[PDB]
Design a binder for this molecule. Structure first.
Ligand SMILES: O=C[C@H](O)COP(=O)(O)O
Ligand SMILES: O=C[C@H](O)COP(=O)(O)O
Ligand SMILES: O=C[C@H](O)COP(=O)(O)O
Ligand SMILES: O=C[C@H](O)COP(=O)(O)O
Lengths: 348, 348, 348, 348
């Protein structure tokens, strides 16, 4: 024969049902999986000491927000948080379950330079991944996340063939391992905005990358019905003085997905990748005005859901109520954007 | 840079508009492009001499059928027919245009064994293809067709890697050449039904083949918005005593497409590949009961539109009216099947 | 540009010089890198308790054999042994250096099933590999080893495409990481002898696998001048009642290498993979009667250098002298075989 | 199974024997296969009318040179010449056979732009190739030639992935078809010298291209024992004011081959690609001073064997003797260069 053995129907059903629950209409993912060093940066921007207690306070602030599950279908956690208790002693997973938010877990081990490239990155973490997935499922996670990173640099030929091949291979292996352990894999091939390239260059690169990713998923026997994609939107580079219009970003982003993503995939959950809170909502809203689409177009936002929540918290306990109000405003905006109903706050 | 140069917006617009016209709701393609030797077989089944006059009579019988354009959006021609006149002196293309049927042209040069394979086939015809496309466009063709063939044989490991790679390469080159010459390419990777394999084996092979085909189309800069796919339905092998149910064929066929075909492609126009006239209609109808779909699911039928028309004609002139009536009955059935409205005549 | 950055000339020179020293005429590698569980098996065959002291005694028995460096250019160690002292307190690396034997280190983390394959194996260990390599170099290792495993099973289509792709990817990543850290990578794609296939089937599979491996090495910017290959010899399957002649094994093995291995690689150091001590020597000798070759054909033997040494030791201290004599007899036989001078003890 | 069927031992033996005869020590190929339009250019440089009679006169001048077979093992012909008679009525093939020179035939149909590339070229000619090969064998050809062309342009990312993939595919198909018809295929992937890139850029590109070519040859079941490679030497771009030294060209050329070409290939027969007659000889001589090599390094020269012969002929009949003397001087120089005996006339 030589083909993939059949996936367990019972496992496949669970994966597909959970992927559709995560990609639920009017809802998206809160990406709260900042590692210890990344959350330091976020905290440094508001001058807060990165104690375990402060991290526990902040994650509890997020996850105990009443009514958050109206707009948030899932929450990506860092490992620490998956096994953490709020300051009041409630396990973080229990706060999520009380809102009906599905817990998810970041499972990559970060980035390492590929030898003899110009600082292009492999994502590490396959070793022990299968055993980690089993433990995380027992702890309550039902989906996973693995971040790969590519750069655009026309003068240096980035992303190089080796970069794309490595990104696709790691994502495909990770996704198949997740599905073997009953976790829905979020496949995150992030093309960074670094540089002064045009939106049309971002579109070309995104198409090449996604074509390679999805071919590799097929090669590794990944069940698209039980997976999710977390791509960059298609935008101008971050060094461009003029940001592309929301209409342009929506057009090129949808076009790049429809040219590469098979429609058995239930959901595309965009990363916000440095965009402002309002841009992230407006760009998603614009895409869902041009629906209906073959897959759900929604959000998996970190900064774009938390930026103002952090600035409102300021590390000050007393600002907890106000901070959660801010988070709800952004969760509502992006849930409405998923439906193409947010009111603000063809090229071949 | 290293990426594909931008396709002409004017050419791309024409290709996309013509592809959508071919994949029009409630309509499909009449495949009337039997070569001289293939039409001999079809004629041998009803005992008719394969004279040029008989071929001209029969193609005129088909294309002059009044009202055919209600259900037929396009007609694939053999080169002879593109430049032929009916017995009454009317160019065949003019009969088509009078019904508003778009003319199309078969442009491959047939099959040749790949060296050191077990009679696995390459499709020939790239040499001079670009110049042929230009002439065919001037003669009135607006779409093309290229047939590749794969076999399932688990004991022999068919289709082999070399078979799939060759099929994908030839289809991608052909499609890019067509689009450079303003012809919509129909991409036909036919997996033959030969053998006693199960429908699930057909499904696995179809997925592997289509994944490879679409990756190659992307590699060769083929515009999916201006292309069409003509695949096999997913069925049991032809040596199986029990034909799969229409519900099963519909489920596995749609599943295989949704797992591999990006939704920028406007249409999937199935070949009937030996099925009976009624099975071809019922299977398509069943797929369009389970819509709406991300692309149009329709037909590009030869035998399944002509079988009874031939048997009613019998080479006898006087049976021309009755023969056209039969053709209209089948065109109507398949147009209705495209809409999921023909009344007869999840596994992961 | 988009190509690999230039490797450091200083690092490349060191790698190339050490690879040529390992592939030195009349010499080969002693593979003494059995993990804790593998050495248990070897010890179980002679009824010896797998204490750390016994492992230290045995490795000291091997490495303190006087005159061993006449025939052994390098010794592959398990991590424990790299940082271990003999029972008398001499570091194992110091015993090696006193004989001028280069220390090497096994750096893979073993095998894991690829999801939805029929128990086909990925090799794990890239995570932390670069940091491990740095530490191992400081501890005295100058080469590394990474074992991948493939199976032949015609009825199951093994090795599958996914198996070969994964094996090649892991070996290429590992090799580039090693070279970035000044370790010569031994690239070991072992096709197991399991099954009843003919030597011609082994030859076909070996060629396909090595073609894929070397293409991946090129893709990952691996310096062939500073690498070594450790392949299976080409033989009948282990279930065959008739073992292939030494002349046949030599012919098909050399043919498979010359059809796939670029001659910039300095050495091919065969694994013995279950062969008897005498067969391993006779097969290598036969290959080097048909020289001179474009690369050194030599040995990296574990069982084929140690089998009789173990049976002579029997865990009994007093048998240490006799055991080392046995080891020297086999080291001499294989060094002589490297030169085509061991006296015993074209098809396209 | 899924692997290539076994090549006929009888056919394989013939191919291997003829490939070794072509790659014979102290000998190389005269490339006299200029098409009608290419020979016009060569003739335009000396002001001669491109009549069939003039072409027949010139090819007869070349092939009737007494003693030419001491240094020329084979002669590549254009189709016209294969079926042509000298002005005196002797078939061209008979002149070759009288000197024991093997006739060869160019079988590609030239170059066509790949759609949506920046004028990157596919080589056409697979259609009817197998039937042409049969006729050419009956006419006396025992080897074939197929030219593919790649460009270096770092700013444009040339050669692009599509260029390399297409070149490799066409060469592999052509080579397998030739071998099925008892013709030794010369595999010619010519990287043009156009541009101002350094020799190290040429080296990197040549390695990438040859790695891809040889992987494709393996994929298509091409017998390396019965094939030949005709690559560019590795040199500075033609816009560079300083030509690389003969020592540099020799070093980088040999290095690029040893890093990519399996040593089962019997011969590498360099194209001269615009070099002067004397540079072509000196560069080859320098490579064969650094032997012995795993394959024969020799020549398949057109301009570098004929330039002075043409200028001495000047279209004037009376200069026939002098012209043949010039040709013999260059044939002798390059035969001596093959042996590293022409007297004039490590970086990782
Ligand atoms: O975009 C995904 C995550 O925010 C990245 O988290 P990380 O920096 O810890 O890998
Ligand atoms: O399925 C497509 C056509 O009916 C095949 O026509 P052909 O046999 O002449 O290639
Ligand atoms: O063939 C190489 C080694 O003997 C394998 O050692 P291992 O079983 O510990 O991976
Ligand atoms: O390098 C090979 C030949 O000289 C090219 O001949 P051609 O220009 O007719 O293709």
């Amino acid at each position: 024969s030589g083909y993939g053995l059949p996936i367990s129907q019972e496992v496949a059903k669970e994966l597909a049902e959970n992927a559709r629950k995560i990609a639920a209409p009017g809802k998206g993912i809160l990406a709260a999986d900042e590692s210890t060093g990344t959350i330091k940066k976020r905290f440094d921007s508001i001058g807060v000491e990165n104690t375990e207690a402060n991290r526990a306070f902040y994650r509890d602030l997020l996850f105990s927000t009443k009514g958050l599950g109206q707009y948030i279908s899932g929450a990506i956690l860092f490992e620490e948080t998956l096994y953490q208790k709020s300051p009041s002693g409630v396990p973080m997973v229990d706060l999520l379950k009380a809102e009906g938010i599905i817990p998810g877990i970041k499972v990559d081990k970060g980035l390492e330079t590929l030898p003899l490239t110009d600082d292009e990155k492999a994502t590490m973490g396959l070793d022990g991944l299968s055993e980690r997935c089993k433990k995380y499922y027992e702890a309550g996670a039902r989906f996973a996340k693995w971040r790969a990173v590519l750069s655009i640099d026309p003068a240096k030929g980035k992303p190089t063939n080796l970069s794309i091949t490595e990104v696709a291979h790691g994502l495909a292996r990770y996704a198949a391992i997740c599905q073997a352990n009953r976790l829905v894999p979020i496949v995150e091939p992030e093309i960074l905005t670094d540089g002064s390239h045009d939106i049309t260059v971002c579109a070309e690169v995104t198409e090449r990358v996604l074509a390679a990713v999805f071919k590799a998923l097929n090669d590794h026997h990944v069940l698209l019905e039980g997976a999710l994609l977390k791509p960059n939107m298609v935008t101008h580079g971050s060094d461009c003085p003029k940001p592309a219009s929301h209409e342009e970003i929506a057009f090129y982003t949808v076009r790049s997905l429809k040219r590469t993503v098979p429609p058995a995939l239930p959901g595309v959950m965009f990363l916000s990748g440095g965009q402002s809170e309002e841009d992230a909502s407006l760009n998603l809203n614009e895409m869902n005005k041009m629906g209906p689409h073959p897959f759900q177009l929604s959000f998996s936002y970190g900064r774009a859901l938390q930026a103002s929540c952090l600035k409102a918290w300021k590390g000050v306990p007393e600002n907890k109520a106000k901070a959660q109000q801010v988070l709800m405003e952004r969760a509502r905006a992006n849930g409405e954007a998923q439906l193409g109903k947010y009111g603000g706050g063809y090229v071949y």
